[PDB]
Design a protein around this motif. Structure first.
Motif: not given
Lengths: 229, 202, 221, 238, 69, 243, 198
Positions: G38-39, G67, G70-72, G77-78, G106
């Motif tokens: 993702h990033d 992502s 969820l806008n996060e 882990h995901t 997190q």
């Protein structure tokens, strides 16, 4: 639903198809004229404000490098039908590695319209199509109807004043026309009913000749309009 | 391209200051991309129209016609009509007008353009009448009438019938000018007759 | 088979040999191993000839439909994704060793797609039986940002190396040079081996195998 | 016979249920305006929170279809969220299938085709929401498009949706008659002042949502309260 | 002709619009332009006045769904 | 435009069967949910229709997950169906992604399910509106409300059922953002008792719960002692108001 | 193939050899084993190139959609969980080991190793690939708690260099990628920046 919503009336007429025809006749004017060396599909592309970017939604769409298609009626129905026509042309090419003949493409689009007339939970397409093509060494102009019927035309018009356009084409049309002259005739027929000054952007034209179907750019349409003024 | 634009604004500035230098620069551009050449032809034709010079612009027509049609824009009828109308709003009775119009009509015939050909033939009968070649005007007008009757537009038809009426009024007295005028009025009664045409009829 | 491709300064150049061997015998001498995916995209094929042909044809049709929908020039990333995803769907059973190459808005791109779906975005690729010799030539005399003519010569040399030093490789060399503006399809680029120049005519006389029956049918025109 | 479901063509055309979907879009109660500059695209929308009990952070009609494409929704909020999820799914599927970001025009074409299917079939209703997509195209610049429940998806230089759609369109029409080459601040100010003039309201930084995409930063950004306040203060001073 | 317009009006732009408006509507447009001029305390009617008057009077713009065409 | 199907638009562009589902929603007793600074507290005015039922015989507070609890209002059958749907959504999310579903995501998924049912005429809109509440250390305390139309909105204090407006005024008379759950429980009991209409319903029970930091981000029914203390607080508040 | 991912306070660093052999022949000399998800999440691939690329693309699509919903920013882990679900479901179809590693706000600085079979386990440092074994003992000997950024980079470079030098199926250049708050910074050790022993 699975039950057809197009059923015969007590007078033996398909009122649903008749109403689709009314919706088509209420659509924007469009004209198709087949010359000796090509075909021209012109159409009114008038927007309701200059906000509307008249370069994103195209009124005339190509379906193959030798087939183009314009419509009169519902824009969304036109979109779905042009997508289906493109898919049919690609399937034909894949099976037979040869560009789909215009007659076959119109036949299959007409079959799609017929099966949407017959099927259960659906509505007849509210558009009439004006396929043009240059298969073989001949020009073809076909009008496909919401009923799923296709007619070969030397030249025709469909839209608001389609009867007047057809009369005008009968008066002005001859078998010996040439593509650049049929374009003049098509733009003149559109002007016959156009309500306002005909700018090079609020109108759209697409030619189809040996080189293949191509939608004339606003510059070329401007030059034709200047020559026709 | 950039040089073409730079010399275009140079020609504009010389139009503002002394038009002759701008006109010479436009000839230089034409002698020297297709868009640049056609555009410059347009501006220099307009400049010659403004200045009243006719022989130079006729030579421009003679020069461009081949290159004009060959280079691009088989719809070059645009430029052909534009330059002819520049002549013919700068009417000067220079004599070369009839030859230029006939050459343009033959070019249109070669290109297979038909409405351009018919419009040029109509204004050609106008030129014949204005230059007193009444017999040729009448013959060409009769041919053009027979064409435009079968190809129904009624507007160029009314114009041509008015020209024939004027020619007969000038030459064959008024047993035929009256008939031609009646035909023109009857044909006009079935169309809008824009104000110019209606005033000419009246 | 021997297909290869290399990205030079202004675009890409693909090069295939010309031969199709049905088994261990030369079935064809002028097989076109470079397939039209899009005006700006061409794909060299190796492995099962029919499988490569139909895969490239299907993706070319899909990309034509996609380009008609978008109104924009298709992209080698799209072509590579389609090829790799389909070849992975058919669990490597769609045997088609592909050298895809195109020139879209984002510069020139060259991918090498394998039958199982794995792809490699390399500056120069070689695939087929002569891939080893072609890659030898590329690793031997390849440098970044080549020019048109030297890239053409490099690919010609690689395909010629494959042809000569590999059995079941082509007779002639076909190239396709794609740039932002031009799409040259040089077919054939060269003919390293033409023919044995048969000796004098040795034909029999006029009439040497008589017939049991004759059924001349004068069909209408 | 039946103007109760779409697939009837009342006997002159006139798909009455689609017209009713448009009426529902208006009935949503809110207004949104979209503009595009020389290098930027902006979407402002009225933000109403009539409770003080609502979080006021979840009351948003600005959604991020993808990192580079934003949207403002008008009309029924449930239908708006459903169409936004469909748009996000279509964009993600396009990225997975073709390998590059979905263009805004193609995304609006997808959602418009889906809405056309709804109008074509009788089982469904044409969900009554208006979507306005914003993005930066690699060649066409700041694309701004608007899809409607009938399947129309024309691209706009400046558009509006909601109760004051006509007045907002007229104001943007007047503004775009003259000097449409708008910088980022100019286009943001144009959108904000269009909404304020049409609503006859002096906007606090609270009751508006602004989403921006710029060529330099082609990432759909929802401006914060501070940035909205800065723009509003500049507007008031000018 | 009975009013005193500024030379910047150019009524052609207003004439060449696709609106079905009667002579009474045209009189109303001109009258509202004059009313706006009086409001601003001017005795010459401007293109601004005519624009505002036309937008105030010809407000028939509503519906005409774009998918029918 | 009739109102016999959710696939039909009113001439006003207003789906009437969804509004009828909402009408059914505002006939259940009442359900408030207050989002404190460190938790969410749900309370339901569970009307004991008959004395024959046992206390807790019609639980309108369900545990959708370890950290998520919903309070429903309307048709109990539809509410239980939606609770099962939310439970399976949370389970699927945990199994696929490997961590507890965020409350916002779960609320969005369930609201989209409700919208799926309010779209077509082959089905009917859910006749229940529910509130979801959760607390997590890394995401705070979240409270959402979803209605028959499928509109998920976050709240600081929300009320559904008959006396939702009265409960809304009573909740607005609070500094929710700065209180603690241990006191918001008493406030919720007070609000339930105030909005309850004795002369109209008479028999009445209060069903409370919270999910907060004191529960380690876990939804639980209020302990018996805490519930009794809150009920006593509400009774004394009513007595003081009467006096 | 040789891949490592080692964790440090405030981020992670991934490293991989750049070889891909179809037998004894190097199909790709400069392969990019590291694949962004993702990033900040990255996956080091090993085993079947086709299976690894397909699962990487599928997980990239799934995580991007997740992502966006969820806008996060997605959790490492995901991402590891998605990879593990796919691999464990299609164990027999896929032959692909993976090392997910990245940073999230997190619990930033995470390394999960999903070997073939599809078991997800967090680790301080994870090793994988054909050349894993030849250096796995060395990394066990040389690793110590409290590695800093540059020291982790040097550790990864040394371990991958040893694996590449002793493993026939591993070679080429060493591609390293450090992920942390600031973002992802890539680098390549070509011919001499690769540490040498003896």
């Amino acid at each position: 639903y699975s039950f057809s919503l197009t059923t015969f009336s007590p007078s033996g007429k398909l009122v649903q198809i008749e109403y689709a025809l009314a919706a088509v006749a209420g659509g924007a004017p469009s004209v198709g004229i087949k010359a000796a060396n090509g075909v021209v599909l012109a159409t009114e592309k008038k927007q309701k404000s200059i906000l509307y970017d008249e370069r994103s939604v195209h009124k005339v769409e190509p379906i193959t490098k030798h087939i183009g298609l314009v419509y009169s009626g519902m824009g969304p129905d036109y979109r779905v039908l042009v997508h289906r026509a493109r898919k049919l042309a690609q399937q034909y090419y894949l099976v037979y590695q040869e560009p789909i003949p215009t007659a076959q493409l119109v036949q299959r689009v007409a079959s799609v319209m017929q099966e949407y007339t017959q099927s259960g939970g659906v509505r007849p397409f509210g558009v009439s199509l004006l396929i043009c093509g240059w298969n073989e060494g001949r020009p073809y102009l076909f009008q496909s109807d919401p009923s799923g019927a296709y007619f070969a035309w030397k030249a025709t018009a469909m839209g608001k004043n389609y009867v007047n356009g057809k009369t005008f084409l009968e008066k002005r049309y001859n078998e010996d026309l040439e593509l650049e002259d049929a374009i003049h005739t098509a733009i003149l027929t559109l002007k016959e009913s156009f309500e306002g000054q005909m700018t090079e952007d609020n109108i759209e034209v697409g030619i189809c000749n040996e080189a293949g179907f191509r939608r004339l750019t606003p510059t070329e349409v401007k030059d034709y309009l200047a020559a026709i003024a | 391209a950039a040089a073409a634009v730079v010399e275009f604004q140079r020609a504009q500035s010389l139009l503002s200051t002394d038009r002759e230098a701008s006109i010479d620069i436009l000839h230089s551009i034409v002698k020297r991309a297709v868009q640049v050449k056609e555009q410059s032809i347009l501006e220099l034709g307009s400049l010659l129209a403004k200045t009243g010079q006719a022989a130079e612009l006729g030579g421009l027509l003679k020069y461009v016609r081949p290159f004009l049609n060959s280079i691009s824009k088989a719809k070059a009828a645009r430029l052909v009509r534009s330059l002819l109308d520049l002549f013919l709003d700068m009417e000067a009775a220079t004599g070369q007008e009839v030859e230029l119009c006939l050459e343009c009509i033959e070019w249109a015939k070669s290109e297979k353009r038909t409405f351009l050909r018919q419009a040029l033939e109509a204004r050609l009968v106008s030129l014949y009448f204005d230059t007193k070649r009444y017999q040729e005007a009448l013959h060409l007008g009769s041919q053009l009438l027979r064409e435009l009757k079968k190809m129904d537009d009624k507007a160029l038809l009314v114009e041509v019938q008015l020209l024939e009426s004027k020619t007969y009024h000038a030459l064959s007295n008024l047993p035929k000018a009256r008939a031609a005028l009646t035909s023109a009025r009857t044909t006009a009664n079935a169309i809008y007759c824009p104000p110019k045409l209606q005033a000419t009829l009246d | 088979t021997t297909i290869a491709g290399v990205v030079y300064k202004d675009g890409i150049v693909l090069g295939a040999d010309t031969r199709a061997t049905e088994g261990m015998v030369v079935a064809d001498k002028n097989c076109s191993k470079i397939h039209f995916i899009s005006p700006n995209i061409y794909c060299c094929g190796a492995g099962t000839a029919a499988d490569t042909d139909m895969t490239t044809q299907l993706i070319s049709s899909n990309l034509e439909l996609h380009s008609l929908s978008t109104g924009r020039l298709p992209r080698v990333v799209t072509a590579n994704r389609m090829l790799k995803q389909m070849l992975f769907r058919y669990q490597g059973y769609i045997g088609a060793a592909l050298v895809l190459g195109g020139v879209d808005v984002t510069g020139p791109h060259l991918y090498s797609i394998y039958p199982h779906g794995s792809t490699d975005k390399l500056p120069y690729v070689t695939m087929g039986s002569g891939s080893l010799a072609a890659m030898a030539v590329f690793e031997d005399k390849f440098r970044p940002d080549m020019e048109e003519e030297e890239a053409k010569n490099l690919v010609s040399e690689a395909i010629a190396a494959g042809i000569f030093n590999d059995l079941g490789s082509g007779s002639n060399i076909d190239l396709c040079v794609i740039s932002k503006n031009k799409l040259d399809f040089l077919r054939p680029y060269t003919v390293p081996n033409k023919k044995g120049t048969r000796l004098g005519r040795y034909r029999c006389e006029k009439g040497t195998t008589a017939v049991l029956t004759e059924k001349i049918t004068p069909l209408e025109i | 016979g039946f103007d109760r479901h779409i697939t009837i063509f009342s006997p002159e055309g006139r798909l009455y249920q689609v017209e009713y979907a448009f009426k529902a879009i208006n009935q949503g109660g809110l207004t949104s305006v979209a503009v595009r500059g020389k290098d930027c695209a902006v979407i402002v929308t009225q933000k109403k929170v009539p409770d003080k009990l609502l979080d006021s952070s979840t009351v948003t009609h600005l959604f991020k279809i993808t990192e580079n494409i934003g949207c403002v929704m008008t009309g029924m909020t449930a239908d708006s969220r459903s169409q936004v999820q469909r748009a996000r799914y279509e964009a993600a599927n396009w990225k997975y299938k073709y390998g590059y970001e979905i263009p805004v025009d193609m995304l609006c074409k997808r959602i418009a085709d889906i809405s056309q299917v709804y109008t074509q079939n009788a089982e469904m209703r044409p969900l009554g929401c208006c979507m306005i997509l914003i993005g930066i195209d690699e060649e066409q610049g700041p694309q701004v498009y608007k899809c409607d429940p009938a399947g129309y998806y024309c691209g706009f230089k400046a558009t509006a949706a909601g109760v004051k759609q006509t007045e907002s369109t007229s104001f943007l029409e007047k503004k775009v008659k003259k000097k449409f080459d708008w910088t980022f601040e100019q286009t943001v100010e144009t959108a904000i002042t269009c909404l304020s003039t049409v609503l006859s309201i002096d906007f606090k930084p609270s009751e508006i949502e602004v989403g921006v995409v710029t060529v330099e930063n082609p990432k759909f950004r929802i401006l914060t309260e501070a940035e909205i306040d800065a723009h509003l203060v500049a507007l008031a001073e000018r | 002709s009975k009013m005193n317009l500024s030379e910047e009006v150019d009524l052609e732009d207003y004439v060449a619009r696709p609106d079905k408006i009667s002579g009474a509507d045209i009189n109303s447009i001109c009258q509202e332009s004059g009313m706006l001029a009086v409001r601003e305390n001017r005795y010459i009617v401007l293109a601004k006045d005519f624009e505002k008057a036309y937008k105030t009077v010809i407000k028939k713009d509503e519906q005409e769904h774009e998918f029918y065409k | 435009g009739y109102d016999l199907s959710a696939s039909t638009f009113s001439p006003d562009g207003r789906v009437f069967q969804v509004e009828y589902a909402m009408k059914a929603v505002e006939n259940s007793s009442t359900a408030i949910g207050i989002r404190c600074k460190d938790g969410v507290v749900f309370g339901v005015e569970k009307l004991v229709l008959s004395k024959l039922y046992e206390e807790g015989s019609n639980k309108r507070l369900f545990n959708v997950d370890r950290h998520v609890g919903m309070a429903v209002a309307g048709l109990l059958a539809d509410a239980r169906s939606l609770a099962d749907i939310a439970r399976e959504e949370a389970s699927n999310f945990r199994s696929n992604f490997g961590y507890n579903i965020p409350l916002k995501h779960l609320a969005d998924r369930v609201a989209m399910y409700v919208h799926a049912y309010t779209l077509y005429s082959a089905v009917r809109p859910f006749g229940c509106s529910f509130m979801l509440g959760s607390y997590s250390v890394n995401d705070g305390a979240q409270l959402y409300m979803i209605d028959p139309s499928g509109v998920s909105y976050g709240y600081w204090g929300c009320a559904i059922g008959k006396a939702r407006q009265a409960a809304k005024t009573e909740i607005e008379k609070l500094q929710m953002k700065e209180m603690t759950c241990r006191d918001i429980v008493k406030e919720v009991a007070k609000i339930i008792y105030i909005v309850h209409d004795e002369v109209k319903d008479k028999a009445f029970e209060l069903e409370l719960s919270w999910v907060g930091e004191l529960t380690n981000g876990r939804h639980e029914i209020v302990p018996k002692d805490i519930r009794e203390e809150a009920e006593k607080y509400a009774k004394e508040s009513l007595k003081e108001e009467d006096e | 193939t040789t891949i490592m991912a080692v964790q440090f306070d405030g981020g992670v660093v991934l490293g991989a050899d750049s070889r891909t052999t179809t037998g004894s022949y190097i199909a790709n000399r400069v392969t990019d084993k590291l694949t962004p998800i993702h990033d900040r999440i990255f996956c080091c691939r090993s085993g079947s190139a086709a299976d690894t690329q397909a699962v990487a693309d599928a997980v990239t699509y799934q995580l991007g959609f997740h992502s966006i919903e969820l806008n996060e920013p997605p959790l490492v882990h995901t991402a590891a969980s998605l990879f593990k679900e796919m691999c464990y479901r299609y164990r027999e179809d896929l032959m692909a080991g993976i090392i997910i590693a990245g940073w999230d706000p997190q619990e930033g600085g995470q390394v999960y190793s999903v070997p073939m079979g599809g078991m997800m386990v967090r680790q301080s440092f994870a090793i994988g690939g054909s050349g894993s074994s030849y250096i796995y003992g060395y990394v066990d000997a040389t690793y110590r708690e409290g590695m800093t950024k540059e020291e982790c980079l040097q550790f990864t470079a040394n371990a991958l260099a040893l694996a590449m030098e002793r493993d026939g199926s591993s070679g080429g250049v060493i591609r390293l990628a450090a992920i942390a708050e600031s973002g992802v910074e890539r680098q390549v050790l070509l011919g001499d920046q690769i540490p040498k022993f003896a």
